[PDB]
Amino acid sequence: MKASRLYTLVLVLQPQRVLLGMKKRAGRWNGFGGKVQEGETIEDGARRELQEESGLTVDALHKVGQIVFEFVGEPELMDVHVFCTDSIQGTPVESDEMRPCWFQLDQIPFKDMWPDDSYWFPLLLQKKKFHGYFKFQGQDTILDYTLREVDTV
Ligand code: NA
Ligand code: NA
Ligand code: NA
């Protein structure tokens, strides 16, 4: 089994809208996140990446899922820990890396999101917790995947 590298993903989910970020350099909407750094907890890495990529500062995040990504031709798995909060207290800010944008929950921009999001994002919206795994050939094609609802992440 391949080694895996720790990443975070953060979804700001309010009752009628969700915050996504357009990857500027790319072209898909995503939650905010990045690699976990040495010595920080996964949740603290998620808070840090939310601040760096979206400008939002939050004190706490709720873990809602974990997704492992395998890319054909790449040696490592991406082990993505997915977090969610409903509670913010500042405005998102656009950088040269991510442009944050709100979407109503009947307008989730799946056509411009990664293909795996079609499977797990509905579980997140239902307040279900999940474990997923997706194998990709390139950016567009899923060759294999698993997804399970769990009671504990
Ligand atoms: Na990132
Ligand atoms: Na899509
Ligand atoms: Na994704």
Curated annotation (Swiss-Prot):
Residue ranges annotated as motif Nudix box: 34-55
Q: Which GO terms describe its molecular function?
A: 2-hydroxy-ATP hydrolase activity; 2-hydroxy-dATP hydrolase activity; 8-oxo-7,8-dihydrodeoxyguanosine triphosphate pyrophosphatase activity; 8-oxo-7,8-dihydroguanosine triphosphate pyrophosphatase activity; ATP diphosphatase activity; dATP diphosphatase activity; hydrolase activity, acting on acid anhydrides, in phosphorus-containing anhydrides; metal ion binding
Cited PROSITE patterns? NUDIX (PS51462), NUDIX_BOX (PS00893)
Q: What is its EC number?
A: 3.6.1.56, 3.6.1.-
Q: Which InterPro entries match?
A: 8ODP, Nudix_hydrolase, NUDIX_hydrolase-like_dom_sf, NUDIX_hydrolase_CS, NUDIX_hydrolase_dom
Cite the effect that the entry attributes to I42K: Loss of activity
Tissue expression summary? Widely expressed with highest expression in thymus, testis, embryo and proliferating blood lymphocytes.
Q: What is the effect of changing G34F?
A: Loss of activity
Q: Where does 8-oxo-dGMP bind?
A: T8, K23, N30, W114, P115, D116, D117
Question: What's any one GO cellular component for it?
Answer: cytosol
Q: What family does this chain come from, according to its entry? A: Belongs to the Nudix hydrolase family.
Name recorded for this polypeptide: Oxidized purine nucleoside triphosphate hydrolase
What's the source species for this entry? Homo sapiens (Human)
Per the UniProt record, the lineage of the source organism begins with: Eukaryota, Metazoa, Chordata, Craniata, Vertebrata
